Ligand binder design. Structure first.
Ligand SMILES: *[C@@H]1O[C@H](CO)[C@@H](O[C@@H]2O[C@H](CO)[C@@H](O[C@@H]3O[C@H](CO[C@H]4O[C@H](CO)[C@@H](O)[C@H](O)[C@@H]4O)[C@@H](O)[C@H](O[C@H]4O[C@H](CO)[C@@H](O)[C@H](O)[C@@H]4O[C@H]4O[C@H](CO)[C@@H](O)[C@H](O)[C@@H]4O)[C@@H]3O)[C@H](O)[C@H]2NC(C)=O)[C@H](O)[C@H]1NC(C)=O
Ligand SMILES: *[C@@H]1O[C@H](CO)[C@@H](O[C@@H]2O[C@H](CO)[C@@H](O[C@@H]3O[C@H](CO)[C@@H](O)[C@H](O[C@H]4O[C@H](CO)[C@@H](O)[C@H](O)[C@@H]4O)[C@@H]3O)[C@H](O)[C@H]2NC(C)=O)[C@H](O)[C@H]1NC(C)=O
Ligand SMILES: *[C@@H]1O[C@H](CO)[C@@H](O[C@@H]2O[C@H](CO)[C@@H](O)[C@H](O)[C@H]2NC(C)=O)[C@H](O)[C@H]1NC(C)=O
Ligand SMILES: *[C@@H]1O[C@H](CO)[C@@H](O[C@@H]2O[C@H](CO)[C@@H](O)[C@H](O)[C@H]2NC(C)=O)[C@H](O)[C@H]1NC(C)=O
Ligand SMILES: *[C@@H]1O[C@H](CO)[C@@H](O[C@@H]2O[C@H](CO)[C@@H](O)[C@H](O)[C@H]2NC(C)=O)[C@H](O)[C@H]1NC(C)=O
Ligand SMILES: *[C@@H]1O[C@H](CO)[C@@H](O[C@@H]2O[C@H](CO)[C@@H](O)[C@H](O)[C@H]2NC(C)=O)[C@H](O)[C@H]1NC(C)=O
Ligand SMILES: *[C@@H]1O[C@H](CO)[C@@H](O)[C@H](O)[C@H]1NC(C)=O
Ligand SMILES: *[C@@H]1O[C@H](CO)[C@@H](O)[C@H](O)[C@H]1NC(C)=O
Ligand SMILES: *[C@@H]1O[C@H](CO)[C@@H](O)[C@H](O)[C@H]1NC(C)=O
Ligand SMILES: *[C@@H]1O[C@H](CO)[C@@H](O)[C@H](O)[C@H]1NC(C)=O
Ligand SMILES: *[C@@H]1O[C@H](CO)[C@@H](O)[C@H](O)[C@H]1NC(C)=O
Lengths: 204, 216, 153, 53
């Protein structure tokens, strides 16, 4: 029986800083850092021993059962995911990115053509662009009514230039429940924006 | 030097059999263990098993036992190997990348890692891409790449010339097994409604290009 | 005792070469490959029901091979000539080689599985020379004393 | 301390330890770590069961 835990895993830091992550374990720990869709790379093994061909900024603090991995002078290339690996159990990991780059989102609605309805399908999307932090609420409403369990939401990677984000909210509808209400709103509340914002659209 | 490499992407139908390979030749491989790791998309890693090149002895967790199988095929000089898996009776939500790694010491540290092979399984078999326009009323503009399978598809605007503030959202898959992703580009506020753009895509698994002339 | 609360289960070898899936040994010149799959399944939950049985003898099929690479890549390929007459072997079963199986990352169902076979040939000896350490004696020692060598004037 | 060891047989076997020795104490379990599944698990018996093949 080997138990695993992690730091709150929702952490961010600025360039040229130092951050600490925590793992609780009762075995051998090997730190792995992983890019997006790439094979993870071994970083620190045995808690404190440092692997050959690794930047010297890393460190390992073996104290009791707690574990630390402090990175110095945070550089842009350090933006990745980190997790501690034991024999079998592997923790979900951590998410690391730049911080504080606040930007107000903007709901963007684009009514489609009638062409896809000829094929018996409707599809409209609510877009949330240029915002940070990620957490927010994006929903659809039919003449300002509840709508849930019918939209698929996707978020692009962290925006490289402005250190921002962008959220997409694609909605699928049937025939009758689409044109029954001409105008819809997509209200979004977010930390970046000062006050919650609602949108309107027309088809013509 | 170690050049641990993994084969290319493979797609199979539900309930069928799939095979993914991995090779290692750049060191004394007759003595280090090999491990397989699979990672569900948007989720942490997951152990698959460990195989000994000495005897080919496999080992599996509880859930994957029976369904999975591990095998090695040595060369005559014991210098170049080729490790193969086989996941019989593929299930629905098992679409994940599969990693081959190497064990360095008794500390269970893995140094060398394979390239990784993308394996996806679903119904709604191979077909071309169809692109449905969005007509705008700063702003944006999207070319919804609907009803295509399987991944991936190239995306570009105006022969790739005009890519002002592109935002290609990752391909989210629906229940139907037909992939759909939204791609938008930053555009001015008052200038839209009169300008015309074009979206061009290519689906390598089906090898069909459709050019769409998006209009207000 | 060595595991807290988990019931134990057994299964035959899950695959690999014939030297692992099989019980390999030697008799008087020729080599045997006995399946031994009826001795490596069971389960044990709480010992509530004592499944008393009669004195049933167990018969194990045993294929016989001649061309063995009994060492993986360092032993020469062999060919044992057939041995004349009936051959019978009686021996001792003193130890069994086991191997655990990994757990799950979501929820263990209070059980662990053991599988026979496996292990390089070294383990067959590490289980016997386990009580021998080799040292050298350093027979020179130094210590204070109240005798000073009475040197002649 | 002994001058040198007792007899040892070079018998070779894979799944079972045929014709070896016995430990008078009890059923012993030996490993590097039982918590590490990679290493083999060696069990030792105190009441040898005869084999006949
Ligand atoms: C754990 O421990 C057990 C118990 O010791 C052990 O089993 C013993 O194995 C050995 C060898 O595997 C057995 O020794 C052989 O026994 C047979 C039995 O023959 C009897 O019957 C004949 C008549 O049919 C009588 O003539 C004979 O005297 C016996 O009563 C012998 O026939 C064998 O003799 C051969 O080997 C001798 C070695 O010195 C030679 O002197 C003899 O001439 C024979 O040699 C022939 O074969 C050779 C190749 O092997 C060849 O080179 C020669 O030129 C010649 O052709 C042999 O003594 C012993 O009986 C087993 N014990 C019991 C109780 O049966 C297990 O093997 C051990 N565990 C493991 C894993 O091995
Ligand atoms: C494989 O087996 C080996 C045994 O052969 C096993 O070694 C064990 O390691 C753990 C930790 O890795 C040890 O736990 C320590 O025990 C000492 C006993 O005095 C405690 O003092 C320790 O606490 C301090 O240890 C730190 C060391 O720097 C201190 O800095 C800190 O202040 C802590 O307070 C700690 O609890 C254990 O003693 C050994 N030996 C055993 C268990 O026999 C190894 O862990 C195994 N590998 C696994 C399980 O992955
Ligand atoms: C040892 O006995 C087992 C008994 O389970 C054999 O396992 C069977 O192998 C056959 C191969 O033709 C399979 O079709 C069966 O499904 C297996 N299980 C059962 C319960 O029959 C095993 O094959 C035997 N060893 C060898 C080398 O044949
Ligand atoms: C296999 O086990 C049996 C059971 O103990 C052994 O039988 C005795 O072994 C001792 C070993 O010191 C001998 O001194 C006795 O003479 C044996 N017989 C009896 C009736 O006690 C047997 O010897 C073991 N096999 C081998 C090859 O030693
Ligand atoms: C062989 O070892 C087993 C244990 O590994 C012995 O069984 C134990 O014997 C003691 C002796 O009083 C009892 O207190 C325990 O309850 C027994 N345990 C079990 C699980 O039954 C066994 O007696 C030993 N036999 C020989 C011949 O040495
Ligand atoms: C070992 O096995 C052999 C053969 O399997 C046994 O020899 C048999 O012994 C019985 C009883 O003495 C006879 O009825 C048979 O005719 C013998 N031959 C055969 C082919 O069965 C031998 O007794 C066994 N010895 C031990 C100690 O188990
Ligand atoms: C690991 O992090 C903790 C978190 O507060 C902190 O005490 C220190 O940086 C480390 N603890 C150690 C080394 O014991
Ligand atoms: C030799 O023959 C065996 C027989 O099956 C075959 O598996 C192997 O691929 C052949 N080649 C080599 C180099 O072993
Ligand atoms: C295991 O069994 C012991 C005694 O039978 C009991 O005290 C304990 O609560 C059980 N569960 C665990 C997780 O130890
Ligand atoms: C051995 O035990 C397992 C445990 O369930 C059982 O399924 C199997 O039928 C038994 N026999 C064989 C030959 O595997
Ligand atoms: C072995 O013992 C177990 C537990 O008592 C029992 O379930 C099983 O039927 C027994 N098998 C034989 C062949 O005696």
């Amino acid at each position: 029986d080997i138990q695993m835990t992690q730091s709150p895993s929702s952490l961010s830091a600025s360039v040229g800083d130092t951050v600490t992550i925590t793992c609780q374990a009762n075995g051998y720990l090997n730190w792995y850092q992983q890019r997006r869709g790439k094979a993870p790379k071994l970083l620190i093994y045995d808690g404190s021993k440092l692997e050959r061909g690794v930047p010297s900024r890393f460190s390992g603090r073996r104290w009791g059962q707690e574990y630390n991995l402090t990175i110095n002078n945070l550089q842009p290339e350090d933006i990745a995911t980190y997790f501690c690996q034991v024999y079998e159990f592997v923790v979900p990991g951590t998410r690391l990115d730049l911080k504080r780059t606040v930007a107000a989102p903007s709901v963007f609605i684009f009514p489609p053509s009638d062409e896809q309805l000829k094929s018996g399908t409707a599809s409209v999307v609510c877009l949330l662009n240029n915002f940070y932090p990620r957490e927010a609420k994006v929903q659809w409403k039919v003449d300002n009514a509840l709508q849930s369990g019918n939209s698929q939401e996707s978020v692009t990677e962290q925006d490289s230039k402005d250190s921002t984000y962008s959220l997409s909210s694609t909605l699928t509808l049937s025939k009758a429940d689409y044109e029954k209400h001409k105008v819809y709103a997509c209200e979004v509340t977010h930390q970046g924006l000062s006050s919650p914002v609602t949108k309107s659209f027309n088809r013509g | 030097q170690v050049q641990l490499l993994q084969s290319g992407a493979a797609v199979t139908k539900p309930g069928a059999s799939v095979r993914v390979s991995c090779e290692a030749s750049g060191y004394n491989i007759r003595d280090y263990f090999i491990h397989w790791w699979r990672q569900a998309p948007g989720q942490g890693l997951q152990w698959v098993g460990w195989i000994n090149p000495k005897t080919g002895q496999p080992n599996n967790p509880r859930q994957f036992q029976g369904r999975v199988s591990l095998t090695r095929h040595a060369s005559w000089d014991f210098d170049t190997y080729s490790f193969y898996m086989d996941l019989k009776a593929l299930r629905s939500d098992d679409t994940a990348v599969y990693f081959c790694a190497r064990q360095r010491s008794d500390y269970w540290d893995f140094d060398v890692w394979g390239s990784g092979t993308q394996v996806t399984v679903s119904s709604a078999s191979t077909k071309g891409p169809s692109v449905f326009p969005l007509a705008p009323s700063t702003a944006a503009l999207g070319c919804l790449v609907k009803d295509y399978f399987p991944e991936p598809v190239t995306v570009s605007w105006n022969s790739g010339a005009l890519t002002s503030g592109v935002h290609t959202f990752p391909a989210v898959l629906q229940s139907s097994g037909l992939y759909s992703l939204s791609s938008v580009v930053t555009v001015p506020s008052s200038s839209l409604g009169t300008q015309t753009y074009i979206c061009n895509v290519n689906h390598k698994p089906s090898n069909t290009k459709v050019d769409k002339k998006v209009e207000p | 005792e060595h595991f807290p609360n988990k019931t134990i289960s057994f299964q035959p070898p899950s695959g690999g070469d014939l030297e692992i899936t099989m019980h390999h040994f030697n008799c008087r010149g020729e080599f045997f490959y006995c399946n031994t799959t009826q001795l490596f399944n069971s389960t044990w939950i709480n010992s509530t029901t004592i499944k008393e049985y009669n004195d049933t003898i167990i018969y194990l099929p045993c294929k016989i091979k001649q061309i063995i690479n009994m060492w993986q890549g360092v032993g020469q390929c062999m060919y044992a000539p057939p041995i004349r007459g009936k051959i019978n072997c009686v021996s001792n079963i003193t130890g069994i080689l086991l191997t655990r199986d990994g757990g799950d990352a979501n929820a263990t169902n209070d059980t662990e599985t053991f599988r026979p076979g496996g292990g390089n040939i070294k383990d067959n000896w590490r289980s016997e020379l386990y009580k021998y350490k080799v040292v050298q004696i350093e027979p020179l020692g130094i210590a204070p004393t109240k005798c000073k060598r009475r040197v002649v004037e | 301390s002994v001058q040198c060891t007792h007899g040892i047989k070079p018998v070779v076997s894979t799944q079972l330890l045929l014709n070896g020795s016995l430990a008078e104490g009890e059923i012993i379990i030996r490993s590097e770590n039982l918590t590490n599944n990679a290493k083999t698990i060696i069990v030792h018996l105190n009441k040898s069961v005869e084999i006949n093949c």
